[PDB]
């Protein structure tokens, strides 16, 4: 199902090197969420600290749109290896 969809997206001329289209030529809006797991190894001598975190970014790429909401198709598809999208 999912593998059936991902192929269809990249059969058309797609370029991950090209910025996603905008309705009015504006900039791509990326929504960012941050999760901090650990803070450690704070160093006062070297003026640095170690931090491990989970980064969550979100943007809209109409080129990757594969469906309407009222279809039998899954809301989201997990991107498999071998397919690059603009990031």
């Amino acid at each position, epitope marked *: 199902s999912d593998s059936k969809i991902l192929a269809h997206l990249f059969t058309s001329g797609y370029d991950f090197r090209v910025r996603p289209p905008t*309705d*009015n030529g*504006g*900039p791509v*809006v990326v929504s960012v969420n941050m999760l901090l797991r650990t803070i450690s190894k704070i160093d006062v001598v070297n003026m640095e600290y170690s931090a491990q975190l989970t980064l969550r970014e979100s943007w809209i790429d109409k080129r990757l749109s594969y469906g309407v909401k009222g279809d039998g198709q899954p809301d989201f598809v997990i991107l498999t290896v071998g397919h690059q999208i603009w990031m």
Partner: antibody
Amino acid sequence: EVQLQQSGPELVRPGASMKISCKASGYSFTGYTMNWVKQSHGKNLEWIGLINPYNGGTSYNQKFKGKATLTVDKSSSTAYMELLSLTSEDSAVYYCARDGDYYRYGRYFDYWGQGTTLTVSS
Amino acid sequence: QAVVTQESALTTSPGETVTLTCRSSTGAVTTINFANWVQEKPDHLFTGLIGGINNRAPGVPARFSGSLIGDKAALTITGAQTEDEAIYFCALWYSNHWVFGGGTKLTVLG
């Protein structure tokens, strides 16, 4: 309090070029970006460019590419705007507007100058 | 390339609530337009009110508050005063440049 005193009004003829000043006071000058806005009679408020006192970096409106040149003197805490090839269209009052955030572009207007009336008539 | 539209002029009474709008021609005014509101007193006096994301200019009264009512920017004055009578300009950010509106001539009847 802070102040943004600009140069006095000037009257010049088409083809010439002059430079408006904007002396800042009451704050760390290198911390706040300066805008320049043009208020004409025929047209609405037109944003020209901004300039970062620290970097010296500038970003102009496409409408005023080459028409205006933003410089800055950190020592005297003064912002300058040079207008080249003045015509009858460039006759307006020019304001300098400060950005509101400290050492970062917050994209919001804080304080304004008293304005500089530039008349360019032949 | 793009035009920002405001109301010609609005009238309000002291103590009441008035809302000034700021409509974009390119579509809905999103948060990346960074709605700015500038007040113009007579004798060419200017001051900033509400800007960018949630920033406010120093000394701006609590009655002034920005929002995004509908699909356009909004400047709401809850509890208007006599000295709030001036011309209010809204500016929208198109990434490359700023664009001001026609400006609204707000009248608070004294």
